[PDB]
Structure 1
């Protein structure tokens, strides 16, 4: 009943000068879900007598 689509983020450009360490950055992610849980319906009962006395 579920359905999965992954998501992903982006990194950011950073500057550096001579002897400066390159700071590592994470790239976050996640997931998304779509869950079917409801049943749409139409329920129309016709009695026998009304059937026998109407087209």
Structure 2
């Protein structure tokens, strides 16, 4: 129950290739780590005599 996602998904893919020699730019993005731990819930007690399945 863990997810890893990049901090920055923006990437300027618009790169002019007209020049013979390209000029790559070294860019790095932090890899986020998000983990789920809590079980969010809501509870509803229904008595025996009462009917819950009724629409």
What is the TM-score when the length of structure 2 is the normalising length?
0.39
Structure number with higher helix proportion? 1
Moved more, 25-34 or 42-51: 25-34
- Whole-Å Cα distance in 2 between the matches of residues 18 and 54 of structure 1? 71
**Higher Rg:** 1
Gaps spanning 5+ residues in structure 1: where? none
**DSSP-derived class of the 2:18 partner:** coil
Q: How many residues align?
A: 55
Note the aligned Cα RMSD (angstroms): 7.3
Contact 2:46 2:52 in 1 (8 A): no
